[PDB]
Amino acid sequence: RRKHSWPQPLKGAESRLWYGGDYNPDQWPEEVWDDDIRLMKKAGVNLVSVGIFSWAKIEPEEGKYDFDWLDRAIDKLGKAGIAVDLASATASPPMWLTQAHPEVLWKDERGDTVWPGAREHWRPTSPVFREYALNLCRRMAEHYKGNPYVVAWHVSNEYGCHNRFDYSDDAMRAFQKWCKKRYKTIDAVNEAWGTAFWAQHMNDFSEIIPPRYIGDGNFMNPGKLLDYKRFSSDALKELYIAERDVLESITPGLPLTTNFMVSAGGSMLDYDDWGAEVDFVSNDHYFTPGEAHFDEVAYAASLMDGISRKEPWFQMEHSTSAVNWRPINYRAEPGSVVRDSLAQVAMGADAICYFQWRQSKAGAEKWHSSMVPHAGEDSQIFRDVCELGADLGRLSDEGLMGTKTVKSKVAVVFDYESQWATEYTANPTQQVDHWTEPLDWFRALADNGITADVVPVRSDWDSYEIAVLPCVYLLSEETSRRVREFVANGGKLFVTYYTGLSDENDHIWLGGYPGSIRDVVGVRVEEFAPMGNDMPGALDHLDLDNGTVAHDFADVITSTADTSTVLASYKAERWTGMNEVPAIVANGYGDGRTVYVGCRLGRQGLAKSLPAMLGSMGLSDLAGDGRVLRVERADAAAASHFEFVFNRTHEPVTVDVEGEAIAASLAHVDDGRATIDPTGVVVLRR
Amino acid sequence: RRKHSWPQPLKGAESRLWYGGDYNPDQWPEEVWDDDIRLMKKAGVNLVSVGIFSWAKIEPEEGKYDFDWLDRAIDKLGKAGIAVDLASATASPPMWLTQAHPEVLWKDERGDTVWPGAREHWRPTSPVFREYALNLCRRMAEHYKGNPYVVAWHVSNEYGCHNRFDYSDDAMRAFQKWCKKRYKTIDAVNEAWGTAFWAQHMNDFSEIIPPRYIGDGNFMNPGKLLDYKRFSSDALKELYIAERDVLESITPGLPLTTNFMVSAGGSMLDYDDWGAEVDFVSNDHYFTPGEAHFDEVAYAASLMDGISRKEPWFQMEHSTSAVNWRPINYRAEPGSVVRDSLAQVAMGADAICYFQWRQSKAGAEKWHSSMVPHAGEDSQIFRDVCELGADLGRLSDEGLMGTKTVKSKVAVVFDYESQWATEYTANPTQQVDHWTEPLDWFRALADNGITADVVPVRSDWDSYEIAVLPCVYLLSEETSRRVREFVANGGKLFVTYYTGLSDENDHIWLGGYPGSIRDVVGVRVEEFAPMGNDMPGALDHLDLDNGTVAHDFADVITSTADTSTVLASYKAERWTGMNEVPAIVANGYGDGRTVYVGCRLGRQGLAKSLPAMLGSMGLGDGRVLRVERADAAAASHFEFVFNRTHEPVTVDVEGEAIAASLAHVDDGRATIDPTGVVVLRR
Ligand SMILES: OC[C@H]1O[C@H](O)[C@H](O)[C@@H](O)[C@H]1O
Ligand SMILES: OC[C@H]1O[C@H](O)[C@H](O)[C@@H](O)[C@H]1O
């Protein structure tokens, strides 16, 4: 795991929260760069990221390099006090390159070539692409070594945004070597993937092909498909590593990151794995319109803080308002510029950046919002960007930098590989993915006044007072041991449906679900009852006797341990078999306590059930006010303490706050009660 | 047509209803096999099917053969008194074979290769593949000939489940030769397919190409697309016959089957045509979750009984509960294991088998339910499986085997080819397929207390008192003549919308629909009025004046015969032009009677309309389905009674109860809970 290393101030500057965004001067005539500088100063901008897609400007024909334009941009910025996060420029190749070498282009499942015309159209395991990317890394680093305004490297851009999967022969060769590395022998691959089924036995590694097109509606080997997702992520990781090491060899000490795609529903790479390979962890994240907007912003940023192991992290990108890439690109509610950003700050970010500085006037993303909209500086969004800039200056003034988000009492577990496993098309239902369950729990906890930490499965969730396994479909023998020990030593554990069905190879744990920990949770599931409305007359819901209603899935629990207590059962017509089948079950195991939730209750059913579940674990006094989210950052050694309070509702609320208000948006504090409007936030120093 | 020949008992054993499932010892350590025997014995299993996907295990590299594992498995079964339905193992090839011979893989409409990774990734007309398959068949037969525990061959597995269509050049060459066989001259092919339209004329057989990709949203030649379905079925049939013939030539007398995919919505192959090529007919059927569950299980089993020409047939596979392959794999309601299976027996099956014996712990079907679940023997499904095996024991004690489901008074006609024709994408409406209408009729009749027989169109539907032609879109001159004679000679006939629109090559019968039999039904339709919800302000339903409602489709009947009676008409706003258009028309023709239903009424509307319609033809309790089997030579009669509702039900029954689940019989009254069933001897 790399040592944490954060981009440092310019020569003649103090440590500040970083504020800025992507900057693309190559899109605008040189004249406008003066105007950019003026407005950056007005907004309180001190860092921007440049060159991300500048390969064709920097190397405009093969072996010829043109730096003067970027040298002049960087100067301008730096003389104005604005620090630069320099890209490798290797995110997307120029047309001369792909024309000269069409073998760089990735191939889809059907073997069809993905052409230029958009971006990132290259095979992650192409050796030709790699040679070109590393050559550009060598040249960039050599040219910018010692530049006094460059403070970090932004390596490539969102690896696997578009090229996560390749099915070319480069990928086939790489996947063969990856399997050999993982499994050693073809026999162990055969064992992993259960190939005795459907005559898929392989005699050697040359018989391993990627999961190519097998006809619509047909079912791929699921162990192979899961491994293909692991491999894809590793393959891109290995390119990133090669790029990083080239840059670092020339510019030792200049911190390197690459930008992740962490959001509740995003699982393109194992971002917990990738977090070990950056000096500081950085995220790209975009609000979900509608009711989930705030809470998922908060969730994603919390997951980021888990991936960063509570080290400060970097919000590389987000949007002031609408994006370009949704079917309907709803605008953000007014106040989102400040509020969302301060939620990312609350959850541990020490940098806040947007895609992008100035709204493009041509190309695919011209309709994506920016800090300077098409409308120009006379706009509400620009005033809001200036307001946030001032707010971040003020939090910098009060010494926010380097505080860490406090440890919660509750860890909500997230597992990228479990999400991958739930994507298989011949699971009990295609309506259940892992990822929705942890978001629901985070939100239901917030409804009960509790801010949880979203914690990756390989991290220290088992160090928390309380933990949640929300649809953690894979549990290895090792993670299973961690579960038994956690509970036996006095841990309090929630476990749900779709948890621990299989080991890490997607081999089912037999004897009754969940096969590896059923003795800890004190239940046994013999079968499932998925639900929905695609079949007239089929079950679409199951009422519980505590006034909640299950949808989509329910475990058919057919026995409970002597130590267990049924807290809720289903109500259903006799013929279904589900009437009075246990739905929510408490248990005691060693010094700890569990609650097993056999169905999907959603945010509203979990929020309602949480007081009774918590009470069965001996925790009735976690009761609190869910109309707001309270998030705390501290440096315990320095005795500094900050509180971030967010209205989660559509009506103004007034709540008791301690300390001195150091920032406010759509909110006001009159001793010592904070009146917070919708989309509003206050920040206090204690 | 092949002489019926049923798999016979092990030496020394008696005739019994067969009970079992797919068995895959290859997936489990040999020590688990001991556990399998014990549990099979407990569950009353007496037959399993083995080796179905074992090619890679039996021929693990090119030219090397490894039989010992399978010899041991079979010996172990047979010694415990469990018979073996042995597969050819040619269902899907090993990676070594596809790696060395990529030309075996099928290609889709776009010419894209379908790779290994799942199953059955081979071209039906690949010569290379056929050589490989026939070699394996030969070797398996030479090796297993005389084995005392193998009672039948299970040839390949579900031909056309994934590889029905291939558009490779092997398919191109084969379809050319099939056309020449069918039409003799290129002029005849041009004529059948109407190639004067859109500059499609062919000068020779080399200008016939498969219905390959023509761009999305475009319209293929329909006659060609229909012939491609007949061709694709035939091609797989030709391979099946070749494999069968190899096996039979080595083990004469061992009965042969291959497993079908017969279900209401299933039409991969013309299964009535394939039923002539098996010694006994075998089916794979999986229940439809929700309201259609029981009726459609029954319907499909009836069709299987039609395909078998009432000879006993073999339920090769079904599920105990959830499958893996649906978007939401709903579980089976309690009682289903016994009930669904006894429905298949009632409709004529003398063997009941599931996919599969032990639920897989790895691979694409591990979430598919089995006889022994992941949970193991301590499970409701396994107890249910054990009860079923007892019940089939009792039924075997009582002489069930060999009895035939009785001849109904009503034949519901089903036609694979008419279903193919209704799949064309520029038909009057893409919401109408043939298959839904015979199922609606079977259910509507049951609602009136009648158990229909589902009878394939080439079979003896015209020997029945009453028959239904439900959206039989194709009627050849020959079939049209059967219709006319059936009725003229005293038959009673229902005919629906979408019946008789075209001949066998999809040329429209001109002059008013249905153009070959409008004189028999006494109606004339000039245009159609399709309906639906995708165009605001367009018609979405038509009330009838008998208090039912039509959806999706109505006939514009503009005249009726002097001999006819309108039984119901539409009511609608004037501007639609449908107001008072006749909807249901009765007729007299010769000594017989017809009724023409010009719209889709669903199970609901048909069920309600049935007394008036039947009444016009000069003619029970729908809460249950009553199904009967019988043998006169043994003087036996058996009645199976199934509750069709979500409420307990009590009904009169005659005879001795010989089996029951979620039901009991007291003083000749049967109280049957939901999902329950009783079987009586009379
Ligand atoms: O839609 C999901 C995906 O959408 C866009 O492509 C965004 O740029 C990504 O960061 C990601 O959020
Ligand atoms: O939302 C659009 C945005 O998505 C990601 O975050 C990318 O890294 C950006 O370059 C941009 O395409």
Ligand SMILES: OC[C@H]1O[C@H](O)[C@H](O)[C@@H](O)[C@H]1O
């Ligand atoms: O468990 C009873 C069961 O066992 C035997 O093997 C028979 O073949 C079955 O017909 C039935 O008698």
Ligand SMILES: OC[C@H]1O[C@H](O)[C@H](O)[C@@H](O)[C@H]1O
């Ligand atoms: O979806 C139709 C098809 O579904 C699965 O493939 C089953 O294998 C078949 O027997 C059939 O029911």
Ligand SMILES: OC[C@H]1O[C@H](O)[C@H](O)[C@@H](O)[C@H]1O
């Ligand atoms: O339902 C799954 C089942 O489908 C068919 O019936 C097949 O023949 C079996 O091998 C199995 O794939």
